[PDB]
Amino acid sequence: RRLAVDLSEVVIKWELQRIKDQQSLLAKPIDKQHTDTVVNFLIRVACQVNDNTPGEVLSRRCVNLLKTALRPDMWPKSELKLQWFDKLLMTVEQPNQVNYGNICTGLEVLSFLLTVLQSPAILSSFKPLQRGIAACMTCGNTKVLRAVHSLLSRLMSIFPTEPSTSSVASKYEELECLYAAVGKVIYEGLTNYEKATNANPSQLFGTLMILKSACSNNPSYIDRLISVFMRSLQKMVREHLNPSGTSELVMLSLELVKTRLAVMSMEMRKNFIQAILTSLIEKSPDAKILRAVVKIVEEWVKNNQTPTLREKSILLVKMMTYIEKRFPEDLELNAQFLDLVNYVYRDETLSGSELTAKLEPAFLSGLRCAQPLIRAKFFEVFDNSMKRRVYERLLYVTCSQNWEAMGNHFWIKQCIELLLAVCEKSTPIGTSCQGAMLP
């Protein structure tokens, strides 16, 4: 079989040399039907040769050889013979013995063909595949789920799912059945996890990946499923707080609903903001979850598609209490949160708001931060808050600044920093101690 792959590579290298020469019977290109059969043999051998439990290396070589065979110069718009994939992908249905590696290689080849082919050719070629792609979405193998997720992501990026809860699953018949199966499996998975008396979030895994693929180029898609998805998200957060992929599924779900606040009902919106995100901030032990929540809140703040000032205030106050307390060692997370607080205090819209009054402990944490870049940004904000005058700053430190929020910090450091800022900076350095100077 390796020898056969070698012959295919020989034909490809002959066409590379033809391209080099062209950049007359010896210079004329190869007959197209031979290119077609070489491409099709490469596809078939790549999908077949993987072992059920080595041929994996020959598969990878065939895949690379196919990726070189289909280029803007080598053999674009070759024919393809995809019908045989229908039999292969249906094997996923059979749980006795199935070559999962073959399924993964075929799905990868399909996603590559989606980058290779022209759009009408994509639509024409993929129609029989729809049953096979739909079959993959059911199996419990995580590798196949990820492969089909990537394939569907690329396909739906080329052709986005229908909005508005339109009755047709797609405007394209070649996508209609596949997209109907995608929607049905999403709905059934969410409903099953809602119904389940006791189940791991891992049951959601494939459902969540497929849903993410369906929403990749159509954020509105989850508006169909918003109630059932929100109840599943509540169940996920509850299972996470009171117990490794759980974090990944919670982050994925949060990324899905982060921009659909206007669709959710008032009770669901309130639960999401003051129940889910707040309990993640307060209870959740995973710092990656905290980083994701802080990123979501930062995107909200920096932007009815965004939360009200009260919800932003609630989230920022919860973060200001919990993030420093629960994760003192995480310098990156605290840096991210203090960067957000710095943006808030720099923002002109929020200046003088109740929020800036509520975030004063966070600002004072920024002034006393052990990370010099944060401390400098906070002092730069602090410096401009008052006039460059000795008397006014002495009055500030005596009268205006409640220093209680500094805690055990020796806040005399901030007084020194504030008053020395008044000094002239551009004057050449010098002394009154002329008797001590080196002549």
Binding site: Y345, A357, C399
Partner: peptide, 11 residues
């Protein structure tokens, strides 16, 4: 004597 305004005074 009027204290200077701070970033935390609710204007």
């Amino acid at each position: 004597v009027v204290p200077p305004r701070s970033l935390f005074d609710r204007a």
